[PDB]
Structures are given as C-alpha cells and as structure tokens.
Design a binder for this molecule. Structure first.
Ligand SMILES: *[C@H]1O[C@H](CO)[C@@H](O)[C@H](O)[C@@H]1O
Length: 36
C-alpha cells in the first residue's frame, strides 16, 4: 500500500497506488502525488 506522506500515484510511479487505511492519495503535482 501507499504510505502516509509518501508518493501514492504520480506519473511514472509504478508502485502501490492504493493507500493504507486512513490515508488518501492526493495529487499535489502531476508527477508527485502524496498520500495524505
Ligand atoms: C511510503 O512507503 C511505501 C511502501 O510502504 C512506498 O511505496 C511509498 O513510495 C513511500 O516510500
């Protein structure tokens, strides 16, 4: 799962896009999306 304050789903990020319970993937920039 994506981590809190970690990148959740940006362009190029092939990692876990689904956040952990209690956190939400929020796109801050097109390439940087942070799980808050
Ligand atoms: C927070 O941790 C997760 C794995 O638990 C990463 O995928 C994420 O990019 C960030 O390092």
């Amino acid at each position: 799962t994506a981590s809190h304050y970690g990148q959740c789903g940006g362009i190029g990020y092939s990692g876990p896009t689904v956040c952990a319970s209690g956190t939400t993937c929020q796109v801050l920039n097109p390439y940087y999306s942070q799980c808050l």
